[PDB]
Amino acid sequence: KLVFKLNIGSEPATLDAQLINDTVGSGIVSQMFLGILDGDPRTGGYRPGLAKSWDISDDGVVYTFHLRDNLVWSDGVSITAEGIRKSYLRILDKETGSSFVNMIKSVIKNAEEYFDGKANESELGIKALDEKTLEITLKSPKPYFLDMLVHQTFIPVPMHVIEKYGQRWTDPENMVVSGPFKLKSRVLNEKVVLEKNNKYYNSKDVVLDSIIFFVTDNSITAYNMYLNDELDAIFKNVPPDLLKDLKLRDDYYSMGINSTSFYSLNMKVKPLDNVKVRKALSFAIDRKTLTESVLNDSSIPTRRATPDYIDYSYKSNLSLFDAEMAKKLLADAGYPNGNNFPLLKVKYNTSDSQRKIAEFIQNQWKKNLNINVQLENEEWSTYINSRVNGNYEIIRSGWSGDYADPMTFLSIFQTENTSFSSYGYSNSEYDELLIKSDNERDIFKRQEILKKAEAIIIERDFPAVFLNITSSSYLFRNDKWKGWEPNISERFNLSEIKPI
């Protein structure tokens, strides 16, 4: 058996692509389910997946995907355009409770109306033109739609098996898949074992028989296993304290990614409803010291809410840190030298890295503002539940881009999506700028509209304390394996791994 073993850093909450909203579930599920387009492991872009090619109408709204021949799920049942269509119908069912459904509704013609019970199934912009032909009609043109199809919310799921098994469909014995690996087994809070799926259209190029995802929040345990030849790799979850040493090693990798770190603020929890308080917290953090002395990675300290992209890049003149101005705002808010500031709880996901960051933040607020916060860790599933349901006061947060356009970031601050940013934030001028950007076909005009929306959250409203643009760290046994490399979107195809 060729077995590749890695630590990914936390137990996934769900392996159901239409319910996953998190990078752990996403990274695993992407090894099992082929999208209409697939991720390009070399660039972090997209490439043919279930569809071998596609057409786009002259007006840019109608996409027509031509499926490759002999597509089957892992139980041999054919993947037809009608099966994919039925898959989209499930995520547009209110009863499924997909927390990402807004991404589908904002893109596809009549998806919102269908979801709300106002349009016939036949009027939805997803059609099976024949067995090997799927048509998707967009609400308005979107140059990043193709790259969007790689995101798990858009990945088709096996409706014959969901129909049958319901809530149990993702169990090892029931799950059937379309990609390079199937789900062999699972030990809760310990392991997810994948095995080669023979029916994958390109199983030809899959040399590994098995991949084992080792779960653990303890980076030291993971690191000791890796030093004793029991892990082939550790993605992201490296010991934050040993980073000075790791950089010197030949099996260490590092890259700037399309991912941000920020702390969300519950606008319904006082005094976080006070813009001056929010501004004080943001200006009271020394961002440069955080990236150079605590992360010590190469993360970019920033007041920005989005990474830069080819069509969306600029240098904000914005101060990374101002303790005097922070104090002044806090005094004007009614808490001079911190007097009468309440004891707020800062939540973060169990993680050695996140702990260290939270402790630095705690210390910045104590030292620069003379306010006290209490730290509190949650296991990954509980942490996600807390963010989504607003069950927090301050919570370590951030976002990994789901597609190659600043909208993936700016979207989480739209009123309806603040499950993924700061609970209860709503600025109708912001919302309206985003709507405008969806309707502006000129790339440079759109850029300017986006910049005015971002300025509202980063210079005016401060719904969150934006901290940096992330760089992730990895260990990978490049003396044993090839066929893996970091990329800007962390879109990995571990089936391309081979021994040297």
Same-domain pairing of 192 and 143: no
Residues 6+ apart with CB under 8 A from 179: 30, 31, 32, 33, 34, 197, 200, 495
CA distance readout (Å), 7 to 188, 257, 381, 474: 15, 19, 17, 10
Q: Which domain holds residue 238?
A: 2-32+167-258+470-500
Residues paired with 136 in a beta bridge? 63, 126
Using DSSP's 3-state secondary structure scheme, residue 131 falls into coil
Same-domain pairing of 188 and 301: no
Pairing of strands 51-56, 464-476: unpaired
Same-domain pairing of 306 and 436: yes
Helix/strand number for the chain, H first, E second: 16, 20
Residues 6+ apart with CB under 8 A from 441: 60, 141
Please give the biggest Cα pair distance in the chain. Answer: 70
**DSSP H or E segment with residue 491:** none
Instruction: Say what the alpha-carbon torsion angle 475, 478, 481, 486 is, to the nearest 10 degrees.
Output: 60
Neighbour count for residue 37 (Cβ, 10 Å):
24
Same-domain pairing of 212 and 271: no
Residue pointed to by tokens 């990402």: 100
Same-domain pairing of 266 and 185: no
Neighbour count for residue 317 (Cβ, 10 Å):
5
Instruction: Say what the alpha-carbon torsion angle 17, 379, 463, 345 is, to the nearest 10 degrees.
Output: 160
- Give the integer Cα–Cα distance in Å for 86 and 82: 6
Same-domain pairing of 74 and 151: yes
Residues 6+ apart with CB under 8 A from 240: 219, 294, 295, 352, 353, 356
Same-domain pairing of 215 and 100: no
Same-domain pairing of 203 and 341: no
Q: Transcribe 170-213 into DSSP letters.
A: TSTTT---SSSEEEEEEETTTEEEEEE-TTSTTGGG---SEEEE
What is the resolution of the experimental data for this entry, in Å? Answer: 2.2
Residues 6+ apart with CB under 8 A from 71: 50, 78, 79, 80, 178, 201
- Give the integer Cα–Cα distance in Å for 149 and 156: 10
Q: What is the CATH number of the domain that holds 441?
A: 3.10.105.10
Structure obtained using: X-ray
State the distance between the two ends of the chain, measured CA to CA, in whole angstroms: 15
